[PDB]
Amino acid sequence: KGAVVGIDLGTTNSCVAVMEGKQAKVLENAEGARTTPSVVAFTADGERLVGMPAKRQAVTNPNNTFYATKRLIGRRYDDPEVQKDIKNVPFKIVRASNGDAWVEAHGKLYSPSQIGAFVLMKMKETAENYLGHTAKNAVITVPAYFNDSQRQATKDAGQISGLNVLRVINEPTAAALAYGLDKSEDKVIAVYDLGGGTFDISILEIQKGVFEVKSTNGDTFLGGEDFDQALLRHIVKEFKRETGVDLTKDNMALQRVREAAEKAKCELSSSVQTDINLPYLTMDSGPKHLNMKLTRAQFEGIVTDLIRRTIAPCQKAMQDAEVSKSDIGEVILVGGMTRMPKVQQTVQDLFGRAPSKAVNPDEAVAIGAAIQGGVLAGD
Ligand SMILES: C#CCNc1ncnc2c1ncn2[C@H]1O[C@H](COP(=O)(O)OP(=O)(O)O)[C@@H](O)[C@H]1O
Ligand SMILES: [Mg+2]
Numbered sequence: 084k085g086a087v088v089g090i091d092l093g094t095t096n097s098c099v100a101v102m103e104g105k106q107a108k109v110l111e112n113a114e115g116a117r118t119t120p121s122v123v124a125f126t127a128d129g130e131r132l133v134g135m136p137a138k139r140q141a142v143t144n145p146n147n148t149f150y151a152t153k154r155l156i157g158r159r160y161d162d163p164e165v166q167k168d169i170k171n172v173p174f175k176i177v178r179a180s181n182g183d184a185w186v187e188a189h190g191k192l193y194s195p196s197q198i199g200a201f202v203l204m205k206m207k208e209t210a211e212n213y214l215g216h217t218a219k220n221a222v223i224t225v226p227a228y229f230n231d232s233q234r235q236a237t238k239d240a241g242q243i244s245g246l247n248v249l250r251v252i253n254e255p256t257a258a259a260l261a262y263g264l265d266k267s268e269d270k271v272i273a274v275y276d277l278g279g280g281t282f283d284i285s286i287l288e289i290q291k292g293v294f295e296v297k298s299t300n301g302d303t304f305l306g307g308e309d310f311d312q313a314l315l316r317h318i319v320k321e322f323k324r325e326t327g328v329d330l331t332k333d334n335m336a337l338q339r340v341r342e343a344a345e346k347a348k349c350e351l352s353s354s355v356q357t358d359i360n361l362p363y364l365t366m367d368s369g370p371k372h373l374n375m376k377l378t379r380a381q382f383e384g385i386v387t388d389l390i391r392r393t394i395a396p397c398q399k400a401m402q403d404a405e406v407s408k409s410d411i412g413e414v415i416l417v418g419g420m421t422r423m424p425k426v427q428q429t430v431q432d433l434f435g436r437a438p439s440k441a442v443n444p445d446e447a448v449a450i451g452a453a454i455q456g457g458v459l460a461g462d
Contacts, residue, residue, distance in 0.1 A: 086101050086456070087453075088100070088207070088222070089107070089456045090222070091446075092199060092223055092225075093121055093448075094121065095279025096119065096279055097118065097119045097120075098119070099209055102453050102462060108453075109449060110210055113209070113212070119205055119206065120134050122134065122149070123152075124148040125147045125191075126147070127189075133204070141341075142337050146175070146188065149174055149193070152198045155168060155184045156240070157229070157233030159183060164303060174188065177192065179192065179194065196236045197243060200240045200243035203221075203240055219247055220459070221248050221456075223452070225253060226254055227283070254276065254417070255287055255417070257454075258442075259272055259287060260450075260451035261450040262441060264413070266292060267289040267290075268290070271287070271289075273285070274417060276301075279419065280308055281301065281305065282301045282302045282305040282392075285298070297403075312341075313389065315340050318344060319340065321375060326371050330364070330365065343360075351382050355378055356378050357376075358375070358377070359375045359376075360374050361374075390426055393426075393429065408435040409435070411436065415438065415442075416430065422444065
């Protein structure tokens with residue numbers, strides 16, 4: 084019947100694709116972007132913002148901007164992960180009536196499934212533009228370590244947006260599907276997944292097309308957003324030095340700096356030097372214009388410990404898989420952050436092999452979701 088959309092409901096960003104003919108097609112939203120920030124915010128008047136609009140005010144509206152709620156979905160408030168999330172995020176996380184971990188803004192409570200549903204709502208609108216009719220059936224990916232309550236709460240997010248979630252599949256298997264590993268006779272796979280919010284490493288074994296997850300590790304609090312924050316703190320400090328003006332108390336300026344830091348980071352994936360240029364950042368004797376040259380080497384030095392924190396979970400995951408570098412047939416990169424050359428060289432060093440880059444790492448999981456969806460559609 085109707086095509087089945089595949090949605091990567093991501094910690095930081097989300098992506099939707101659908102089978103068109105013999106290949107999956109990634110769909111772009113109304114803003115022209117092929118991914119959508121998994122961000123939901125409520126302004127002082129109570130209007131709701133989703134995606135890029137919410138992201139663009141995250142720093143000036145920290146109390147009422149929900150982000151990385153995938154860290155809460157399907158979790159009890161007393162889960163140590165939730166308590167760790169409370170220490171790391173500024174919006175209010177609260178204990179629901181059933182002891183579940185919920186969020187709160189302006190006196191109103193929301194479950195993480197409701198926040199996810201708002202994101203999925205947007206994913207659905209994006210898909211329906213392309214399809215020309217209502218999207219009924221959905222395949223949504225989840226991390227391999229998600230337990231039953233976390234899978235169920237992701238399905239319920241889908242239902243809230245009107246989607247019949249025909250199946251939930253693990254993100255590293257979805258990515259492997261995007262790479263055609265579905266027909267592998269005997270092959271061990273490493274899936275290195277550095278997203279905007281979280282880091283995952285998974286060791287998969289494929290035998291006659293059967294996927295087994297042999298080990299899982301990572302750091303739920305290591306993502307590209309931390310690379311951006313570390314570049315922000317370095318910018319704030321160099322500014323306080325050259326000008327004597329301290330930006331930390333200036334959320335309007337910090338929002339500009341966070342935007343600049345993420346832009347600069349991404350340019351350095353492709354060139355060795357980039358310019359941070361923020362005219363009239365502060366009007367402190369007169370205006371002060373921020374203008375810094377940032378090199379790849381400097382940025383690599385600023386984020387060194389962040390990249391290195393991916394090494395020990397990977398070695399741990401090979402130990403738990405009773406696998407060695409030699410036994411790993413292929414390493415696949417997932418997440419935007421793996422676009423960074425130093426990250427790719429760190430992956431190379433870990434697994435003794437050039438990682439595969441054949442599939443856009445931002446989009447591989449959504450693509451695999453769509454492939455699974457086409458299978459379910461019989462096509
Ligand atoms: C070549 C080149 C330049 N291209 C890039 N260079 C560095 N970073 C990039 C990036 N294009 C996206 N990014 C992102 O990586 C994180 C989100 O990735 P993500 O997988 O979608 O997040 P989630 O899975 O958690 O939802 C986020 O920091 C953002 O900079
Ligand atoms: Mg990712």
